[PDB]
Amino acid sequence: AFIQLSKPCISDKECSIVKNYRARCRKGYCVRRRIR
Secondary structure, three states, rough: OOOOOOOOOOOOOOOOOHHOOOEEEEEEEEOOOOOE
């Protein structure tokens, strides 16, 4: 096991289709959501 402190992801600005991707990023927390 590699005991490590988890770190957040890129900002919502970057988590948008600007980068062709689509994820929900809030306060650094990164979750790939569904519409339904």
